[PDB]
Amino acid sequence: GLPLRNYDCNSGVIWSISINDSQDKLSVGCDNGTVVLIDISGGPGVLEHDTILMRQEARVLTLAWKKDDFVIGGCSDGRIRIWSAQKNDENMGRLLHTMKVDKAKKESTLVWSVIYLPRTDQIASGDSTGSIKFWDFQFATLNQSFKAHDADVLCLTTDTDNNYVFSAGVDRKIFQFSQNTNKSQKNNRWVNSSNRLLHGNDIRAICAYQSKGADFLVSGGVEKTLVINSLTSFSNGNYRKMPTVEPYSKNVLVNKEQRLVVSWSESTVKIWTMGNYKLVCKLTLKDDQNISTCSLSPDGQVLVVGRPSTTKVFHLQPVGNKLKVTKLDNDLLLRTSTKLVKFIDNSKIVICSCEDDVFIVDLPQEVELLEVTS
Amino acid sequence: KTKKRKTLKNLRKDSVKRGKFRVQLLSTTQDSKTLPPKKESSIIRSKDRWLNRKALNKG
């Protein structure tokens, strides 16, 4: 759960990332209009600079790939651009065509999302005007335009056979565009089949997955919750709204003795006491890393705060219906990563490091662990 | 009150001006490796301002 490798793009800040079909190159869109190709075929943790495509003045907001040959990018000047990325070709790194969307009169226009459709050889793009446009890739022209949304179209996604294109955005709606019918396939015409309102706020991220046993259209956004649908039965199929907070890792603990609740969120720990509830103490930590886990001794005097980087133990003394905080120094814990920490007694603890090296500390006695077959 | 905040700001500074030269502190290597780099405020703010622009009348 740590950063294996940090690689700098050699360009402006990143806005969009996308991988090609063969999964050996990353395309990285930049604020200064550049699109950088990074090679990852070397191996895990290996990222090498491959090439810089032709430059331009508009911010690249999104990227999509056609196999490994062409890089399609949406820009902040209201234009869709096709770069050639194929090697062994004189046109490598050049801007083949430029397409322009309808531009809002009293506002700037942005192409938030672009996706490539292998079956029909079309590009589907969403812009800030609320339009979904289907472009013919070979000739770089508009085949169809749908004024569907009332606001920005922030994401697009397609099914496996490209019989469905799903859009979503600020207006909280999910529009299904269908080309399943045989006459539609012959004529290559998309249709605004249906729409649904499932989210309470914006829809920023959407994805689709299909398999012989699975059919998911998962979406999420500012509401901070997932919404799951069926791609094939989107119009009429049931949907599930996942819980906002599903506490697999607990962020709050309770001490039966002295009646204390302790909650830790974003490097800050709050302690309350109940007879009616009073905040006895708040603990603020300098480190940027969020607290992974907090364990309190049965007596409640000793509080251990664990992070992947360091583990700090603070002693609490109740004074004047308030807790006095002191940081006991233990160098071994400070250099120790703490995935999980528990108390044996008021004195001894067990810590499971990020490398799964379990050991006991008195306030290290390592414990053997059975080897897991690969 | 505010001086305590300003004192906190003074501790949270990685450079100081020694005349025409500015000495700057270098962060620990683990700090960079352990955690990804910070977001650039102007860039993220531009995205959020647009999505919350007045014309949408999100109200």
Binding site: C281, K286, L323, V325, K327 | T7, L8
Partner: peptide
């Protein structure tokens, strides 16, 4: 709540 507050870095400094 500043009556009950504790700051590590301020305590570290003094």
């Amino acid at each position: 709540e500043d009556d009950v507050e504790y700051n590590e870095e301020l305590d570290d400094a003094g």
